[PDB]
Write a protein that binds this ligand. Structure first.
Ligand SMILES: O=C(NCCN1CCC(n2c(=O)[nH]c3cc(Cl)ccc32)CC1)c1ccc(F)cc1
Length: 586
């Protein structure tokens, strides 16, 4: 721990670590609940937002598996739960961390909660972490909060004492991020949107659990922030908030662990902790530089391409350099970029979205295809139309039935995962933007997972020994996205061969065409200006005009993959005109 290690990390790589990945929140929360049940001494929790009354197993038939009830039972047995909540700037965010603290600490005297920061600041504590006995640690993109629970069904509806409850999302757990922001979080079992007209917005995320040494390294990170935050206020200096100490590295298991080499990475600053680190960014660049075959990226944000003193991280540049290197050498290389169709902010898309939606879309489009720094502009300059062979930018969307007619909604990609060559994976809370990767701003956590055990697989039609952890995760991502359960003829062994890549491009193009034609949903390439947008949304979509005819054409949708519309509001500027740094959204 003395020096910095690989990628300038505070923790060295840990071989022989059993790690299990999770996709969506159903498995992650159920695994967390089972690990909490087996806790004997200590539980560490860091959350950007923690909802005290959230259920970890669904459908809820009792108060068992509710997060507050579980921690209260564990504390009654002598288990100390130390929780680090991010303190929002109140009535400017709305997670009501004050209520979360008050609810948690009143459960039992063994549950201590601290909040950081008190000073006015733009940056947040964004890492999500649960560590049990310093031996079992959960991390990834999932907060123990409302709306995060979901499975591969991605249901848009939930219409159904709770002895026979059929509601998977109870009260404030049923939400649509773009429709309405959360309100009155101290009344959890009251709806704040109408289930009979407004569909929920599905949550797609990635998480991971590691055991042994990497959990000690993550527990070390928690302990440092705990002892540091103790010196930040007058009240936490009290002995009711004891100092925390790590257990020595020299010293139950979750079912699902693959033997891997795991290295913990982090983004911390002397405001968030006591030192500076950006090992997550370092691991991202190195993994892209040393990739040999493909990159699979699933991120909530994609803001990069260090340009004009506004965006500084070089993740986009490394992708361009790697694609140009593959193009020069003429080798088979693919980059899959999966993003949410819209940023997860409340706004009226039929008007063009709010300030937040527009600000994020500006830097996102500036990163991908608009301007001389964008990935596509630099790629077209060197290879012309051939860029379509190396990079694919897509989103996810699903459809359902509500009110007697088809309804559609995007699936919110909150994951922060990178897969390389079916051998290397990065899972954490860090978005691809300056706020997460620089370290000087938001505090983030991640793990670098390298496979030491392989399976027979394919790579551009050649025999390939792919890592078990990475290949299983990548295949599960491909299968759910492409709807492989209904199409078993699809071969997911080879991720870069031309036959699969065209099928990937064709399905994303085809699905986006059907959703546009049926739902006239946004974002879309059909509205390149706010003036065309005002006329576009005036027409009633076929989904409500003739639901029978809508359903007949929705039978041709396969999977959830849709092409990301790169020309949406292409003729507009998309940047709020008062006294605010643009690094708020970068
Ligand atoms: O959970 C909510 N929405 C989901 C979409 N958001 C989630 C967090 C995400 N995010 C980052 O990735 N880094 C951030 C830094 C900061 Cl300071 C703030 C957010 C950050 C951005 C998108 C929500 C909860 C309570 C409400 F009242 C309203 C919304």
């Amino acid at each position: 721990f003395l020096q910095l290690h690989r990628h300038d990390s505070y923790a060295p790589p840990r071989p022989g670590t059993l790690a299990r990945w999770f996709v969506n929140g159903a498995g992650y929360f159920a695994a967390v609940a089972d690990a909490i049940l087996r806790a004997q001494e200590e539980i560490f929790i860091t959350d950007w937002w923690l909802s005290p009354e959230v259920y970890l197993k669904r459908p809820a038939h009792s108060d068992d598996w509710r997060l507050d009830i579980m921690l209260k039972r564990k504390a009654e047995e002598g288990v100390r739960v130390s929780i680090l909540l991010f303190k929002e700037v109140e009535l400017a965010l709305g997670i009501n961390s004050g209520y979360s603290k008050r609810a948690l600490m009143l459960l039992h005297p063994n549950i201590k909660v601290m909040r950081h920061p008190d000073q006015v600041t733009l940056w947040a504590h964004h890492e999500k972490l649960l560590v049990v006995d310093q031996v079992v640690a959960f991390l990834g993109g999932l907060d123990l909060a409302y709306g995060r629970w979901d499975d591969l069904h991605y249901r848009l509806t939930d219409l159904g004492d709770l002895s026979h409850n059929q509601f998977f999302w109870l009260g404030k757990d049923y939400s649509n991020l773009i429709t309405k922001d959360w309100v009155q979080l101290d009344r959890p079992f009251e709806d704040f949107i109408d289930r009979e007209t407004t569909p929920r917005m599905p949550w797609r995320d990635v998480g991971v659990v590691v055991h042994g040494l990497p959990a000690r390294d993550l527990a070390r990170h928690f302990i440092q922030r705990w002892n540091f935050t103790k010196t930040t206020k007058a009240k936490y200096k009290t002995p009711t908030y004891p100092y925390l100490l790590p257990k020595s590295t020299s010293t139950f298991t979750l079912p699902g662990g693959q033997c891997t080499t795991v290295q913990v990475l982090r983004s911390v600053d002397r405001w968030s902790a006591g030192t500076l680190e950006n090992s997550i960014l370092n691991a991202y660049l190195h993994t892209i530089r040393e990739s040999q075959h493909f990159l699979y990226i699933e991120n909530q944000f994609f803001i990069s391409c260090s340009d004009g003193r506004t965006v500084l991280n070089k993740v986009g540049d490394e992708i361009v350099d790697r694609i140009l290197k593959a193009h020069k050498q003429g080798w088979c290389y693919r980059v899959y970029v999966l993003l949410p169709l819209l940023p997860g902010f409340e706004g009226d898309i039929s008007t063009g979205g709010g300030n937040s939606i527009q600000a994020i879309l500006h830097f996102t489009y500036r990163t991908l295809c608009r301007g001389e720094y964008s990935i596509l502009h630099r790629l077209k300059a060197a290879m012309g139309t051939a860029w379509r062979d190396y990079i694919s930018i897509c989103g996810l969307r699903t459809h359902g039935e509500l009110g007697g007619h088809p309804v559609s909604e995007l699936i919110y990609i909150h994951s922060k995962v990178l897969i390389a060559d079916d051998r290397t994976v990065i899972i954490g809370s860090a978005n691809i933007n300056d706020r997460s990767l620089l370290g000087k701003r938001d505090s983030e956590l991640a793990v670098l997972i390298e496979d030491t055990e392989t399976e027979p697989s394919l790579m551009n039609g050649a025999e390939y020994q792919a890592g078990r952890f990475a290949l299983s995760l990548r295949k599960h991502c491909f299968g759910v996205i492409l709807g492989a359960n209904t199409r078993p003829d699809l071969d997911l062994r080879d991720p870069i061969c031309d036959d699969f890549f065209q099928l990937w491009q064709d399905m994303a193009e085809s699905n986006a065409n059907i959703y546009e034609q049926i739902f006239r949903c946004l974002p879309s390439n059909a509205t390149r200006s706010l003036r065309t947008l005002r006329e576009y949304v005036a027409v009633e979509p076929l989904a409500t005009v003739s639901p029978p005819l809508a359903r007949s054409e929705l039978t041709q949708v396969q999977g959830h993959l849709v092409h990301f519309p790169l020309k949406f509001l292409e003729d507009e500027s998309l940047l709020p005109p008062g006294m605010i740094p643009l690094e708020v959204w970068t």
